[PDB]
Write a protein that binds this DNA or RNA. Structure first.
Lengths: 222, 299, 339, 215, 223, 237
RNA sequence: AAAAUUUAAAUUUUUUUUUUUUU
């Protein structure tokens, strides 16, 4: 099982080795790119791990610590795709600020990172209003002084924020947060594009070199 | 796109009617004064009643007639609102209601009424006729548009002339403009519409089962006046005392005996203004011909 | 306080999605384009003509097809296909009134469903305008010389054609532009793809009946009557055709241009005012604001020029440079596909 | 008329003219549209009839409507240059299209996400001296290749085969049917209508997987 | 210089101007900044939507491009960062043609820019510079060049031209070109000559204009 | 014969001066330069002001731009909880007003105003780019309950520069002749709003028609007889 | 003769051009 077309039938649910006289059972575990599909053939049923995508087979395992063997099946592309890497709960997503409310802040999803950096930008055109947009509520900006929140003192339109997914929310937008000392503002130009490039003075403040002008943004830890 | 007015301001005018006052300075049953001025082109006119300003345009060209009435020429009126005349309006909403409330009137005021002989657009039957066009532009609103566009179109028809024609089968000879004169058009009757504007000072029930008629009706609602009115009514007549259209499409309930008593007062109003058009058409054409006298003696 | 503020840098595919503008400014530092080109590196142009007209096969022209002369255009990452039909109305030196044009309809399949987009609605107008301002087409080229189908002996038909000269008739032509994978400005490729379709248009042989059955009819008035004229329906031949007559010495070609001004901050080592042409690549189309678009026919001719100056100044010399770059890019394409 | 377009003067008219087991064949190509994320190109030519058409993917696009658990498909059939199929004739096929892919696509992988499918019936020869029914199975193939190009979770290379005015769509190497379409034909020819469809399906899916795995 | 203008002639609208050159009467209207729609906003700059009504007929494609080139010119005139998440609807009315709309669009494009420039002054919005446009033609038969032709001269014109310039420092420095609408047949050599009068003439136009603005508005101003 | 200006003129003053910016001038965020960007007449603040001068252009407008510490008149249009929806000018953007920004500030006490009322309030906090905010009661009131909701009255719209002269100027002849007939109230709104209540609607119409006419004619010296005539026009009766 | 007793009301945007109905 190496290279896969969508529909390439790969392996059953279970397999068997004999490692030194004692019998060891395999547990083929479906992952992304997979689906167990039952198959009757000449009478008898059969479940099988199915390639549902384009690229490479990859079989892995990890047990949770904090004679059978679980084997995660994992299917990949191999030698540009983001529907592969749709945002799930808790992820770190780079976004651009769309509009500032007194209530809240609104951004659009652009780029999703990954675990052990590795990214996945969306390949979409925002000028259609195509992309997924999300919402940061103003009390969710940080937890330190979470009540008397001054929204303008952390964000302006069009700016880049390393933010964490809260949850799905509705279908229209997202529940999103920045409430950490490592999260928040990544980069913007001065006066929302009307001036040059600005650098985070602290983790807590931001200036600009040539100008001599600073602004308050909830910057990320660099 | 929403006009916002305080309810305090709402009671204010409603009080002023209850003491027989209105903010403009007219009487209740008094109409604005009308300024009519023509451009150099035929079928070109600027019409102005105080704050409301309009402009329209008449033209014509060659087309075939329909199968429907193969005898007669073609004619239609455009009344596309631009949000220039007020920020309420969409960019050319032909599907808004008030637009239709502006539309169907002028549709009935002109087209179904037939002030203009469409049969006098027949150049040759079924082959080539006229396509006469009426583009209405609004400039700035203080209401009375549907009365203004009533006038300014009918103003424009009495100033447009069409050029000279000669027929030989297909050899249809449109002549040069300046050798052979342009020829004006045939108006069967001159219609003038009147906006009526209605104000209950009371609740519903004292209009409904309060037998006492107590409802104030005025002419030519100004902009602030127009935003609180309760019924909408327009009648149209002529010089020969026939009633062209009436449209009360709902709104406030309303006594019949009022409406006849209303429509009689329309008559004396519209007649004087009508003749004022009639002299100015002459007098401008007199000024055209006196300047034509100031041209041939000059040249 | 003198501070080594360490910035945060990214993969380049991250950057362009974020900053169209600064990622451009990265390319300008090396002096390149984010379409990986250097300043004046221009896209290849590839066509096939006449494939989708029925007049592709000169040997066997098929039956139910209705297409006059066709053009395929691919250049860069945008495929555009040009199709020509024509219609006929019953018709009854170098000045504009001698000059007509066609009726095109563009569609850009840019993912959006819905009505006619405003980018498209400009296009078919803008072409038609300078086609008139090209003065390509005297209406003598629209004059149709019909034959009459002589009902000859034993039930056979031959169309008597007159040659070398009562009603007249006129071709009226049409176009359709389909746009696939829009990556930038489209108008130059809208222009140039038409031009090769224009040279492939045959005029099909039109004829009327010998004596059409469809004759004069009368209509009764309320006492009077008139006569409908006889309805001679023109018919184009299934077979014969003639080509199209062109003021060939006015066939232009298209080219756009962009001039930018540069930040000192944006450099990476491996005033300052740069001309770019062959514009593409959204980041470019966002951020270029003083621009130049030119029509030109290869002997130094110019159908039009289009300046929108919204960014930089314009020198007299970037003008001449673009003019120098005009007569190259056009003249090659005149000679490239030799149609 | 239509104030939004250039349609010429009205009294003109277009030009008029009067009279004076076989092989199907493909040429399948992907990755050529940069607006999309999934593209597919199809040439077809068979015995009097040559056909070319384009299938275009936009996804996953955001949904401004509301929450859904999973994905949603949208399919457009548009006339190309010459052949003009009827408007209501189009969307019936678009209805028939969506039913099959709703036994294909892992929508559950794609919550609140849209699928846009643009099909361009671009150019067709019919030089032969239910005319839409002869073009059904090639659509599904053209969609599947573009949907592989956007790389979306698809259960099977499902395909349809044709036997004389009859369209039957398969999976599992034909061992199940996912989409059924019938016009006039014979009566109880179904059993032969199993076969010739199946083998074209047995042909076509092999042609498809060659187009991708060899690239 | 048979041009003439009016400022502040509408009522419910922020900026209004009648521009009257030699034959064409055109009024422009400006409303802004006002509440933008959902599909129309920009997070940073100012959104602009522009409507031109012809004198004759309705809004079609012929109107559409004259709109859209006029979109391009105003965008650097406006200090666009000053009004984020906002909208200024601007609307132009063609009232008089003064030119064959079937054959030309030249003078109107010169006219409407010269119209809309002044209603913004009525509107008093943060702007950047000063501007002007003129129509220029070159005769087919005489082969000479007239600034501000007529429509019969357009009939014998070979090539029609509109120049839009950006004027600063007392409106004297050509800061930039805005629009050069080269249409008709032309070469290299005519073009630098074609600028070279309009280099002067548009400044000569604005030289009139600078006066006119203050004459109309300083009595509207208070002392 | 003034310090008249255009956007795109030469700015008069030297660059090395400590200068508080007034409105109408714009500093470049990109190239740090500063230019007059509006139409009209500059008025240079004269010297001696701590060595710091100030430029401002007289420009004319009707469309009011919300700016801070400014007294405006507003309309209750929605009850977005904790925080009112209020408008200041038709077709413009709505403004947000706290429910608590009120002279008896009490968070358990929710006040009483309803949709469609007229209130007097000052712009407290307003970025150019953010949802603007106002206050009736302010800290800059200094515990003053001087703003507030209005009663019925009557409100008239004028252009802004006129309304400045209503506020900023005692030489403005209007309040003289009006006090010379009857006694009444006046609220001044920098949003071009002028709210008046009299003892009488009769005089209020007399108050109405003058202010429409005078601001139209905009000729302050002529306003003696023009005002008094409308009284006779009311005293026509 | 004292003593005291009770409440709580809802916030921030998705769509396809106008004929044409019997003197």
């Amino acid at each position: 099982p190496e290279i896969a077309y969508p529909g390439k039938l790969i392996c059953p649910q279970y397999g068997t080795e004999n490692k030194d006289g004692e019998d060891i059972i395999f547990n083929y575990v479906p992952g992304p790119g997979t689906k167990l599909i039952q198959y009757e053939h000449n009478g008898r049923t059969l479940e099988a791990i199915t390639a549902t995508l384009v690229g490479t087979v990859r079989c892995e395992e990890e047990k949770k610590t904090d004679t059978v063997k679980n084997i995660l099946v994992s299917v990949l592309p191999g030698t540009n795709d983001f529907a592969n890497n749709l945002p799930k709960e808790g992820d770190i997503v780079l976004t651009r600020v769309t509009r500032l409310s007194l209530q809240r802040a609104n951004v659009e999803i652009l780029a999703v990172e990954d675990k052990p950096a590795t990214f996945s930008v969306s390949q979409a055109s925002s000028d259609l209003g195509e992309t997924f947009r999300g919402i940061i509520r103003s009390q969710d900006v940080r937890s330190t002084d979470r009540d008397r929140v001054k929204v303008i003192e952390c964000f302006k339109p069009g700016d880049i924020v390393r933010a964490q997914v809260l949850s799905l929310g509705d279908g229209t937008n997202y529940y999103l947060t920045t409430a950490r000392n490592d999260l928040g503002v990544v980069f913007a130009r001065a006066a929302n594009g009307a001036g040059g490039l600005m650098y985070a003075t602290d983790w807590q403040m931001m200036t600009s070199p040539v100008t001599g002008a600073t602004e308050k943004r909830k910057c990320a830890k660099p | 796109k929403d006009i916002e007015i305080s309810a305090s301001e709402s009671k204010f005018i409603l009080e002023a009617l209850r003491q027989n006052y209105r903010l403009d300075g007219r009487s209740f049953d008094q109409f604005r004064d009308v300024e009519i001025t023509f451009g150099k082109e035929f079928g070109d006119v600027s019409v102005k009643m105080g704050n409301t300003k309009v402009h329209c345009r008449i033209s014509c060209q060659i087309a075939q007639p329909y199968e429907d009435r193969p005898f007669e020429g073609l004619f239609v009126i455009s009344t596309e609102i631009s949000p220039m005349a007020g920020s309420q309006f969409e960019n050319g909403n032909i599907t808004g209601e008030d637009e239709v409330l502006c539309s169907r009137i002028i549709e009935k005021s002109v087209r179904r009424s037939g002030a203009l002989d469409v049969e006098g657009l027949c150049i040759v039957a079924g082959s080539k006729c006229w396509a006469v066009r009426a583009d209405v532009h609004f400039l700035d609103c203080d209401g009375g548009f549907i009365d203004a566009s009533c006038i300014a179109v009918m103003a424009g028809l009495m100033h447009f002339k069409k050029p000279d024609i000669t027929v030989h089968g297909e050899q249809i000879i449109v002549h040069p403009v300046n050798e052979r004169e342009p020829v004006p058009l045939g108006i069967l009757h001159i219609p003038i519409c009147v906006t009526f504007s209605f104000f209950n000072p009371q609740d519903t029930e004292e209009n409904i089962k309060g037998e006492t008629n107590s409802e104030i009706s005025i002419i030519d609602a100004t902009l602030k006046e127009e935003l609180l009115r309760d019924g909408v009514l327009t009648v149209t007549l002529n010089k020969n005392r026939e009633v062209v259209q009436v449209s009360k499409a709902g709104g406030l309930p309303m006594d019949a005996l009022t409406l006849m008593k209303c429509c009689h007062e329309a008559y004396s109003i519209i007649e004087k203004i009508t003749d004022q058009i009639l002299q100015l058409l002459k007098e401008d054409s007199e000024k055209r011909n006196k300047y034509a006298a100031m041209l041939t003696s000059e040249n | 306080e003198t501070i080594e503020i360490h910035p945060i840098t990214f993969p380049p595919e991250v950057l362009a999605r974020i900053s169209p503008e600064l990622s451009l400014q990265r390319h300008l530092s090396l002096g390149i384009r984010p379409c990986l080109r250097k300043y004046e590196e221009f896209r290849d142009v590839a066509i096939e003509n006449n494939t989708l007209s029925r007049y592709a096969d000169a040997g066997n022209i098929d039956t139910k097809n209705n297409i006059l002369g066709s053009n395929v255009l691919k250049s860069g990452k945008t495929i555009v296909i040009t199709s020509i039909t024509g219609g006929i109305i019953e018709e009854t030196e170098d000045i504009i009134a001698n000059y007509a044009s066609v009726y095109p309809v563009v569609e850009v399949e840019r993912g959006r469903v819905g009505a006619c987009t405003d980018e498209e609605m400009t296009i078919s107008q803008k072409l038609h305008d300078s086609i008139l301002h090209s003065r390509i087409l005297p209406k003598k080229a629209l004059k149709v010389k019909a034959g009459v189908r002589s009902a000859n002996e034993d039930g056979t038909f031959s169309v008597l054609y007159p040659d070398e000269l009562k009603r007249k008739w006129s071709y009226v032509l049409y176009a359709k532009i389909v746009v696939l994978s829009r990556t930038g400005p489209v108008f130059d490729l809208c222009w140039n793809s038409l031009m090769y379709a224009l040279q492939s248009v045959k005029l099909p042989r039109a004829f009327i009946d010998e004596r059409a059955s469809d004759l004069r009819m009368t209509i009764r008035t309320r006492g009077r009557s008139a006569t409908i004229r006889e309805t001679y329906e023109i018919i184009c031949d299934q077979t014969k055709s003639v080509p199209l007559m062109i003021n060939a010495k006015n066939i232009a070609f298209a080219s756009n241009y962009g001039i930018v001004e540069l930040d000192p901050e944006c450099q990476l080592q491996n005033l300052n005012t740069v001309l770019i042409a062959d514009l593409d690549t959204e980041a470019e189309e966002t951020s270029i604001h003083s621009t130049i678009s030119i029509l030109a026919a290869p002997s130094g001719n110019y159908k039009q020029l289009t300046l929108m100056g919204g960014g930089a100044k314009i020198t007299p010399e970037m003008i001449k440079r673009s003019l120098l770059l005009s007569r190259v890019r056009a003249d090659d394409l005149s000679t490239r596909f030799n149609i | 008329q239509d104030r939004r377009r250039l349609l010429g003067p009205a009294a003109a008219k277009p030009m008029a003219f009067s009279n004076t087991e076989s092989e199907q064949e493909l040429s399948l190509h992907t990755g050529f549209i940069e607006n999309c994320n999934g593209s597919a190109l199809v040439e077809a030519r068979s015995l009097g009839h040559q056909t070319s058409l384009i299938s275009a993917v936009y996804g996953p696009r955001s949904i401004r409507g509301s929450f859904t658990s999973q994905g949603t498909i949208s399919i457009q059939l548009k006339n190309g240059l010459l052949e003009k199929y009827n408007t209501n004739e189009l969307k019936e096929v678009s209805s028939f299209l969506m039913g099959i892919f709703n036994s294909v696509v892992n929508l559950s992988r794609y919550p609140k996400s849209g699928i846009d499918i643009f099909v361009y019936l671009t150019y067709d020869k019919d030089l032969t001296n239910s005319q839409i029914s002869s073009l059904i199975p090639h659509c599904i193939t053209s969609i599947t290749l573009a949907l592989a190009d956007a790389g979306i979770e698809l259960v099977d290379m499902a395909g349809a085969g044709e036997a004389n005015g009859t369209v039957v769509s398969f999976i599992k190497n034909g061992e199940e049917i996912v989409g059924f379409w019938k016009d006039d034909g014979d009566d109880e020819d179904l059993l032969e209508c199993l076969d010739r469809c199946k083998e074209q399906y047995n042909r076509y899916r092999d042609l498809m997987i060659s187009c991708l795995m060899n690239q | 210089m048979s041009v003439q203008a009016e400022i502040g002639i509408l009522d419910h609208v922020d900026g209004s101007s009648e521009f009257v050159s030699q034959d064409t009467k055109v009024i422009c209207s400006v409303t802004g900044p006002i509440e933008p729609k959902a599909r129309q906003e920009l997070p940073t700059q100012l959104a602009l939507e522009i409507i031109v009504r012809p004198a004759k007929g309705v809004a079609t494609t012929r109107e559409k491009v004259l709109e859209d080139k006029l979109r391009a010119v105003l965008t650097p005139l406006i200090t666009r960062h000053c009004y984020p998440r906002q909208l200024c609807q601007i609307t132009c009315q063609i009232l008089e043609s003064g030119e064959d709309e079937a054959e030309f669009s030249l003078r109107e494009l010169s006219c409407c820019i010269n119209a809309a420039f002044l209603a913004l002054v009525d509107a008093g919005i943060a702007l950047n510079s000063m501007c002007a446009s003129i129509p220029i033609a070159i005769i087919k038969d005489t082969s000479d060049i007239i600034v501000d032709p007529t429509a019969e001269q357009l009939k014998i014109s070979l090539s029609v031209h509109t120049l839009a310039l950006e004027f600063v420092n007392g409106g004297k420095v050509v800061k930039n070109v805005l629009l050069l609408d080269s249409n008709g047949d032309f070469n290299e050599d005519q073009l630098f000559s074609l600028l070279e009068l309009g280099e002067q003439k548009c400044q000569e136009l604005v030289t009139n204009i600078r006066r006119i603005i203050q004459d109309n508005i300083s009595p509207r101003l208070v002392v | 014969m003034s310090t008249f200006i255009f956007p795109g003129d030469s700015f008069p003053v030297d660059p090395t001066t400590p200068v508080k910016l007034g409105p109408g001038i714009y500093c470049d965020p990109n190239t740090q330069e500063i230019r007059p960007v509006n139409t009209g007449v500059l008025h240079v603040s004269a010297k001696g002001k701590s060595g710091v001068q100030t430029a401002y252009i007289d420009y004319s407008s009707k469309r009011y731009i919300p700016s801070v510490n400014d007294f405006v008149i507003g309309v209750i249009i929605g009850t977005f909880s904790d925080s009112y929806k209020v408008s200041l000018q038709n077709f413009s953007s709505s403004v947000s007003l706290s429910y608590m920004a009120f002279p008896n500030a009490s968070k358990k006490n929710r006040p009483t105003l309803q949709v469609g009322d007229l209130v007097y309030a000052r712009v407290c906090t307003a970025e150019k780019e953010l949802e603007a905010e106002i206050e009736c009661f302010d800290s800059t009131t200094g515990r003053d309950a001087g703003f507030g909701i209005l009663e019925d009255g009557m409100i008239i719209d004028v252009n802004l520069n006129f309304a400045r002269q209503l506020l900023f100027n005692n030489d403005f002849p209007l309040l003289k002749v009006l006090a010379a007939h009857t006694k009444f109230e006046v609220a001044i709104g920098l949003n071009g709003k002028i709210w008046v209540k009299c003892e009488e609607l009769s005089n209020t119409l007399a108050c109405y028609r003058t202010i429409m006419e005078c601001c139209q004619k905009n000729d302050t010296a002529a306003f003696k007889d023009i005002a008094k005539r409308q009284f006779k026009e009311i005293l026509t009766v």
